[PDB]
Write a new protein. Structure first.
Ligand code: HEM
Ligand SMILES: N#Cc1ccc(NC(=S)NCc2cnc3scc(C#CC4CC4)n23)cc1
Length: 371
């Protein structure tokens, strides 16, 4: 019962059935994007980017073409800026790609950098459209290097977003039940949300079968990095012919995901409060979500607190149903921390401490919401 927040009841915040091809006015863009592994390895990518003609965004008509093109030029920008991923950076992004990229990003109210809604939510397809949404029947649209495990990283994350869609559709009835004062309906709605969050934990387990720790840490993580607070581009990136000053934009982060923020909001977990670093980062990352999903989070915050409603009723059954979702959220973030230890902390030993303190802070705040 959500209206124009661009939430799908099957795939949630993910883009349903993303477009795979752009108009023929843009083959020059997509030939580069489709061959990023070979163009980067051979050292040809940067020159092809500098060889491109400046195209107009006026031939991108519908919303899906605008999102796919945003994914196409976002991966090209990452490839051009980071190159072969070994430290030799580009600090200027050529005008014939920088101007249409920023023009399209202002059109979609997104920053001109690859974000979570680009390479996870809009970077997928079904192998055969009549078989279900499972890893074996899905594939990504774009990757950076052969063996970067971008498919495993993006698809498993996407599958977690799909598993969360089952709990998102319950949100309108949680709020309807509190307003209409229906305790029994509220209890069932909370237990249904807890069940869906418990089952999303099992989807997290698939990351061990499709992502390699060395490939993720030494390759994939490099291409998703940004230029805010980064010593490699200490002043940001120069977007040619759009700004004359260098601009800083944060690297891709799953803090840009709306799924875990929307359940923090729904359950009254004030992840955005307290003035700490973690609360600061999660609020800023809302600028990197699609505006419709930004608006969905805002309206969720406007509704009455589910936590304070449950606390004020002296109802043990309602409290335990609320605690089941909070526990399910804690379990997701605890298992996720174990993944970070395996895929970042240990590879980095063979920087990583500030990341785990952020995730520990976010999990600790979730845990202290227990009633
Ligand atoms: C190899 C696998 C993974 C690694 C190494 C990893 C690592 C990280 C790191 C370093 C952060 C903090 C910096 C940032 O936000 O980008 C983070 C945040 C986050 N990641 Fe992942 N992650 C992995 C898989 C996943 C998956 C499959 C999901 C499913 C949605 C996910 C969801 C999140 C969320 C929601 C956050 C925000 C923090 C929070 O809400 O608690 N991660 N992850
Ligand atoms: N050293 C070090 C180190 C420092 C920071 C990071 N942060 C990363 S890769 N954040 C993205 C992320 C985190 N979790 C998940 S699930 C799906 C995605 C995605 C995506 C595309 C980028 C938008 N993500 C990793 C390593």
């Amino acid at each position: 019962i959500s209206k124009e927040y661009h939430i799908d009841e099957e795939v949630g915040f993910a883009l349903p059935n993303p477009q795979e091809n752009l108009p023929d006015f843009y083959n020059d863009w997509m030939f580069i994007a489709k061959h990023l592994p070979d163009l980067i390895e051979s050292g040809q990518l940067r020159e092809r980017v500098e060889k491109l003609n400046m195209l107009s965004i006026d031939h991108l008509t519908d919303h899906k073409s605008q999102r796919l093109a945003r994914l196409v030029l976002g991966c090209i920008t990452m490839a051009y800026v980071w190159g072969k991923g070994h430290g030799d950076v580009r600090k200027v992004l050529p005008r014939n790609i920088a101007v249409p990229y920023c023009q399209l990003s202002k059109k979609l109210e997104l920053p001109p950098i690859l974000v979570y809604a680009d390479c996870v939510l809009a970077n997928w397809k079904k192998k055969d459209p009549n078989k279900p949404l499972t890893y074996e029947n899905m594939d990504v649209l774009f990757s950076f290097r052969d063996g970067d495990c971008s498919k495993g990283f993006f698809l498993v994350s996407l599958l977690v977003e799909i598993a969360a869609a089952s709990a998102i559709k319950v949100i309108p009835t949680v709020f309807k039940a509190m307003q209409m004062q229906e305790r029994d309906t509220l209890l069932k709605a909370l237990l249904e949300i807890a069940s869906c969050l418990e089952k999303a934990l099992q989807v997290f387990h698939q990351i061990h079968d499709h992502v390699n720790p060395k490939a993720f840490f030494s390759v994939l993580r490099i291409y998703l990095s940004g230029w805010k607070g980064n010593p490699q581009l200490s002043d940001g990136l120069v977007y040619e012919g759009f700004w004359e000053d260098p601009k800083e934009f944060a690297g891709g982060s799953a803090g840009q995901s709306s799924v875990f923020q929307c359940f923090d909001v729904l359950l009254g977990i004030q992840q955005t409060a307290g003035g700490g670093h973690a609360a600061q980062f999660l609020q800023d990352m809302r600028r990197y979500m699609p505006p419709a999903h930004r608006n969905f989070l805002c309206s969720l915050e406007s509704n009455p607190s589910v936590r304070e409603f449950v606390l004020s009723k002296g109802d043990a059954g309602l409290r335990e149903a609320y605690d089941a979702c909070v526990k399910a959220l804690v379990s997701l973030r605890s298992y996720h921390l174990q993944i970070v230890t395996k895929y970042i902390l240990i590879p980095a030993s063979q920087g990583g401490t500030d990341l785990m303190n952020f995730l520990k802070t976010v999990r600790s705040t979730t845990e202290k919401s227990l009633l």
